[PDB]
Design a protein around this ligand. Structure first.
Ligand code: A1EIV
Ligand code: A1EIV
Lengths: 485, 485
């Protein structure tokens, strides 16, 4: 499908040569308009626009296109600025992204001080958004000085494209930025400014991006207080519930902000939102994943999600979902990828009987051992207290790899199980507060009769032997937490 | 092919005898011209010039030819110096190199102070450039005092041949010199003076050697700050991308600076540039390797690369390349040697399924066990956490040699894998900052639940058992690094 490359690269080289030869303002503007048209038609090329646009961006990278665009962007006249920034925001691929991070930092901030031209402001917002898509060190250095002031000022504006770009930029800050970056942004009242934007009924896209940024901020368990004080959290769920993934898929074809799909890096960033223990974050992540799933199915690719690994997260959500809209979104996405829909699994693992054990074993595809469990009368308690030796000898799992897979499944089930039948001190809640996966040990401690009050007097040997916590790091963390009452 | 040897040895002996008998300036000049012509025709002898020139250099080494040239180079008249140095730069093989390093230090420097004669300066630059190929202590001593000033002054000159000699000299200083030598050169503003040279569009060779020196300096992670402040880094990639190795091969036949190939030691120095973790350095290394591959294939030698080991680096680059220019260069170089081009492997190693495992196993040529991997349902997580005993028993690799080979392949894959799916504290980035190979351990730490923040509270036993870091030295280094936050 390189015919388009042979169609565009000669014209692109000619246009780049003209742009380098363009010393006059009119010639600069004409060349910038031509290259902008070329990159736009490359982007909108049906079902193949992404890779051809990336190739055009690479061809711009050679011949020093980036420095030429920066040079034209430093010109006194605003026409050069607007045209150059319009071109640049379309071509800010990861390679050009890091090149700008290395070289062009500081001029972009200075021209971002030019908040008055809204037409320029939209393009500058796109530039800084794509910069936020870059690594975290760039996030601190840019967001600290040029980020919050410019993004908040343009959020206070009313133009739709600028607000949409600002919301996307804030979402990228929340995703690629560190917990310190999110903390600083939250302290900068960013959520409070986003609250009208998410409450702005005009555009669904702006509200969606604002909800995404709010959810990613809520993933930080240190600033969530003022985050929920913003009130957007109670707004996130009704919005995602009201919207239709199929409707969103049919739309955005005309408004091609994401019509050509979304970068695998962006989806990889989104995936952690599923296992975030925050219902709004999981809702918005599921909605985005379902929308991108529909878009890719229209394009005809589903392997990218498996490469990212969202399949496992979605299936775990389906098996361990209590909400209705989360279940609907996950099932719809899985059916969009042409994947099986697992039946929800009964959470009362401690009270499980043989039927539940057989069902769960068949669900993890371990039928070869099912009868043995049925032979051994395995129930919830025994399954929860199952050990390596018992699995190997009594149940005949003589291959270590199979035992490792079984213990991985058991770890997942333990982490996402409800122990309300047995515990009474909410030891599971405390362990999850320390770390989600720590919940895997909860029943063991319950099997030991340990209590929160008694936790400060437990020992390492008691943890390893009685509680069966094989990992030394987890034992050390638990002991350190328990020593502090 | 000793016919050339018996053609040259008697004539060379006669010329050496005449030069020894030459007391007058005119006789000295005549003898020097004759021996220079002989060594020139010996070097340019088709496809066999190297060994015959080496034999001529050995014949000069005997009969005190080196000390005769030194004494003539100590003469008052400039003509004798220029002729003697013209001969010497051609006859400065490694043996003559070390002899001059032992004996002729300081007189060469003193005549290098005579920077005014540009024709003499060319030969002096050649002498010092070849001298930089010697050991690092000699490099320290001689480069520290005379080399820097002479090369900077001659770079300030306009002679293309002198400039090319200086660029090659700086590249040799960067390669053969130690980290202290590189630091001293960087402190001498070397890259800043190189910037106009690389920016001088006239000579492709001069720009290429300047970019080579810049890249080798950039391999140092202590002084790269001012190196990228020089600005040549943004120019390195366009140069290598624009040029064609075939163009470099068909050309330079007349300008026989490298038309007879390059010393295997030089290629051995070049190979580390491929695994230098810096895109520009790998680009220039790949370009040089492809050019030398073309030259050798035209000559008909490919085993030299296997002896040097560039095949492994090229294949690792091809498998684990994200850039297009590097991929194209490495693929073309491998096709020059008639070696298979491996298919690039999916970087999302944690998210691999059975098909990816089968593909990777077939790529490393471990087909004999693929079905077993299929039988045990090994996936990315299991493969990354696979142990010695599990491999030996479950997968039936009873021969420890095969297990060591498989674990070496797994170590390489881990070092070059992408863990962004699993980790979130960028622990891989920190480990690579400590040491690239340390990246192999990252997943294990991720499997242990360890992050950057808790790194300072890990212990040796936790590293050995939970993280499975078998090497005690690596464990000690990681613990020491973690103790310092
Ligand atoms: O996520 P990616 O594409 O690697 O990087 C973002 C860059 O791509 C352009 N873009 C992506 C998608 C669809 C359209 S119309 C345009 C953006 O303008 C930005 O420059
Ligand atoms: O070749 P090596 O061992 O890297 O360098 C040793 C000597 O060979 C001469 N030489 C080799 C080949 C082609 C020409 S024109 C010249 C150089 O003058 C150098 O002093």
């Amino acid at each position: 499908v390189q015919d388009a490359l042979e169609r565009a690269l000669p014209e692109l080289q000619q246009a780049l040569s003209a742009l380098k030869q363009a010393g006059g303002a009119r010639a600069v503007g004409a060349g910038l308009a031509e290259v902008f048209q070329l990159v736009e038609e490359a982007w909108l090329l049906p079902a193949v626009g992404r890779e051809v646009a990336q190739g055009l961006c690479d061809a711009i990278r050679l011949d020093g296109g980036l420095d030429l665009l920066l040079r034209l962007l430093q010109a006194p006249e605003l026409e050069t600025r607007v045209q150059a920034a319009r071109l640049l925001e379309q071509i800010l691929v990861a390679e050009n992204r890091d090149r700008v991070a290395r070289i062009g930092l500081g001029v972009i901030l200075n021209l971002a001080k030019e908040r008055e031209p809204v037409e320029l402001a939209r393009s500058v917002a796109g530039i800084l958004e794509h910069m936020f898509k870059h690594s975290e060190e760039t996030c601190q250095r840019l967001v600290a000085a040029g980020g919050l002031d410019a993004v908040l000022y343009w959020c206070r504006r009313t133009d739709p494209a600028l607000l949409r770009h600002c919301a996307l930029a804030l979402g990228n800050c929340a995703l690629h930025g560190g917990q310190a970056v999110q903390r600083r942004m939250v302290e900068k009242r960013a959520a409070e400014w986003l609250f009208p934007l998410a409450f702005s009924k005009e555009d669904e896209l702006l509200r969606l991006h604002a909800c995404l940024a709010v959810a990613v901020l809520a993933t930080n368990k240190e600033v969530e207080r003022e985050v929920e004080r913003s009130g957007t959290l109670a707004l996130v769920e009704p919005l995602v519930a009201s919207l239709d993934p199929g409707r969103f898929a049919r739309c955005l074809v005309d408004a091609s902000d994401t019509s050509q799909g979304r970068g695998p890096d962006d989806l990889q960033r989104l995936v952690p939102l599923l296992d975030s223990n925050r219902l709004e974050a999981q809702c918005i992540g599921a909605f985005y994943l379902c929308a991108e799933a529909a878009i890719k199915s229209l394009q005809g690719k589903t392997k990218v999600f498996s490469d990212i690994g969202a399949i496992q997260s979605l299936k775990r959500l389906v098996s361990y979902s209590t909400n209705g809209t989360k279940s609907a979104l996950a099932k719809r996405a899985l059916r969009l990828l042409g994947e099986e829909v697992p039946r929800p699994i009964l959470p009362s693992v401690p009270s499980w009987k043989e039927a539940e054990v057989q069902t769960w074993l068949q669900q993890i595809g371990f039928s070869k051992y099912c009868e043995s469990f049925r032979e051994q009368q395995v129930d919830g308690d025994l399954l929860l207290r199952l050990t390596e030796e018992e699995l190997q000898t009594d149940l005949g799992m003589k291959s270590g790899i199979t035992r490792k897979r079984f213990f991985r499944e058991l770890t997942e089930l333990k982490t996402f199980a409800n122990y309300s039948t047995c515990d009474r001190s909410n030891l599971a809640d405390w362990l999850g507060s320390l770390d989600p996966r720590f919940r895997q040990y909860t029943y063991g401690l319950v099997s030991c009769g340990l209590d929160r009050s008694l936790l400060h007097r437990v020992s390492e040997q008691q943890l390893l032997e009685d509680c069966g916590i094989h990992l030394g790091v987890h034992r050390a963390r638990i002991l350190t937490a328990a020593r502090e009452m």
